[PDB]
């Protein structure tokens, strides 16, 4: 399923994420989009599904992110809800639960999310345009 | 030749470009790094060698870029010298002069150059680290 509405779910969720801030949206993930050797779409997804999943699992109850105020704690609570959802969809479209994250370079969650939001919208374009 | 000094030539030139401005560094190229399906390293290069080459050839004597003042015209003159050089190296490492630029989305020359500068530095890391 390649031009499935799951793409819209991914984009629609990407927007929420990209339009928010936290002390955690600056911590780094593996830049799987720093590769020159490349792969295949479903593996592009399993790899991305992987890094996103390593993050939220590593940062769900992280001290640097839980927050001082209420609006902050709320924000982080929301940040992790979305990561889980964005990831839930990625694994489904990837349909591949094994991943060789061969990369050294790290982006920031936020800058990585933009690139995912971009790749996804290009993937969408090819579905309608 | 994969960990050749040509990589340093590419990075070293990428730095000059990325650390400069022009009225032309905002005009758009094809975002070949918006693909999810992916390819192979030498094809990643032929594709990049292609877009860069379409640009300078399309913008060498472009009115929006030639410049009003002297420092401006000089800058554009320099912008195109580097594009030719960065491209000269890419074709050599790509060793492949045929390219299927299947992409719709466009980045800006400047934002595309950053990503190339990044991919290149990751490619370098794997050569020494």
UniProtKB/Swiss-Prot annotation, chains A, B:
Residues that carry a glycan: 38
Transmembrane annotation, as ranges: none
UniProt-reported outcome of changing residue 9 to A: About 500-fold lower interaction with IL4R than WT
GO biological process, one term: positive regulation of amyloid-beta clearance
S-S pairs: 3-127, 24-65, 46-99
Localization terms from the record: Secreted
An example molecular function term from Gene Ontology annotations: interleukin-4 receptor binding
Highest rank taxon of the organism: Eukaryota
Keywords carried by this UniProt record: B-cell activation, Cytokine, Disulfide bond, Glycoprotein, Growth factor, Secreted, Signal
UniProt function note: Cytokine secreted primarily by mast cells, T-cells, eosinophils, and basophils that plays a role in regulating antibody production, hematopoiesis and inflammation, and the development of effector T-cell responses. Induces the expression of class II MHC molecules on resting B-cells. Enhances both secretion and cell surface expression of IgE and IgG1. Also regulates the expression of the low affinity Fc receptor for IgE (CD23) on both lymphocytes and monocytes. Positively regulates IL31RA expression in macrophages.
Protein name (record): Interleukin-4
Organism: Homo sapiens (Human)
